[PDB]
Amino acid sequence: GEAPNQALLRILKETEFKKIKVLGSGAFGTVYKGLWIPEGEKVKIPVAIKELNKEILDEAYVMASVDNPHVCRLLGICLTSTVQLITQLMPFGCLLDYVREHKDNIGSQYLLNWCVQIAKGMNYLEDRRLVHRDLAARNVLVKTPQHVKITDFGLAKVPIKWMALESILHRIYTHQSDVWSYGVTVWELMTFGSKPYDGIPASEISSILEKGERLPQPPICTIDVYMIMVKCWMIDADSRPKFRELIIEFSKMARDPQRYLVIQGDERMEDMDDVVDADEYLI
């Protein structure tokens, strides 16, 4: 029923990349800020290098199969004694931290454009018949403040406060259950990083949603924006919007940003000669 997955998985020599600095230490892995120089190609590509296995290779398998401006991509892997994944560096970190750090300087144009790009990347995953199951502001990376990407397909094929009701109850996951988390994600951005249902036990979340309660309208949010969030959180999943509609809706609003989001002050907010961004390095 499926078409053959003709993705290419690139194996890289460890002498082809050098690790400059550390970005994260996690029980699963440690990740390095680094640089990748394909052999005799006279390019240096800024990369994130992950060191730790059926998990890490499943992750690599998925990332090698996606090609989209708003989805993270795998550049290659190294079958070193400790297996290494080589991915594109996202200099500004994850969007959740970004939004918390710079709230006093984030305008409505930026917020709405991010909603467009995540909708684009998620619509792409739907095209690829792929289901993310962990979309959240913590899993959107920032390449430039103008360009974000969806990341962390650890669960692609547990975060209850981002989860659709069907998912909490029956462990069902859909593109439409992804739309729910898109709404929760949008809510994280419009509240500038607040935690959803803060100070609530996860065990209660299922009953609360069944009662008809949801997350509050963020102060900067016109009802136009909040209506879109609310529709992403309907019980009936064929009632929620399609990602392709979310693209259209947020794109309309991104034309007149100030009409949809009201933000105080919103109006006015050694050798690197051969470095190329991975987005322009093609094979």
Ligand X SMILES: CCC(=O)N1CCC[C@H](n2c(=O)c(-c3cccc(F)c3Cl)c(C)c3cnc(Nc4ccc(N5CCN(C)CC5)c(C)c4)nc32)C1
CB of 188 to ligand X, least distance (A): 13
Structure tokens at 46: 């800024």
CB of 243 to ligand X, least distance (A): 21
Binding site for ligand X (CB under 6 A): 23-24, 31, 48, 50, 59, 72, 85, 87, 89-90, 93-94, 97, 138, 141, 151-152
**How far is 124 from 9, CA to CA, in rounded Å?**
20
Instruction: Check whether 212 is labelled as a binding-site residue.
Output: no
**How far is 194 from 119, CA to CA, in rounded Å?**
21
CB of 136 to ligand X, least distance (A): 10
Helices first, then strands: H and E counts in the chain: 8, 7
156 within 8 A of 61, measured Cβ to Cβ = no
Instruction: Decide whether 72 or 190 has the Cβ nearer to ligand X.
Output: 72
Distances (CA, A) of 252 to 8, 45, 222, 232, 233: 37, 35, 14, 18, 21
Instruction: Check whether 192 is labelled as a binding-site residue.
Output: no
Instruction: Decide whether 24 or 219 has the Cβ nearer to ligand X.
Output: 24
Discontinuities in the chain (C→N > 2.5 Å), after residue: 52, 157, 269
Instruction: Check whether 28 is labelled as a binding-site residue.
Output: yes
Please confirm, yes or no, whether 273 is among the known catalytic residues. no
**Catalytic one of 58, 67, 104, 134:** 134
Instruction: Decide whether 136 or 209 has the Cβ nearer to ligand X.
Output: 136
Which residues belong to the annotated binding site for ATP?
Answer: 23-31, 50, 87-88, 152
Residues marked as catalytic: 134
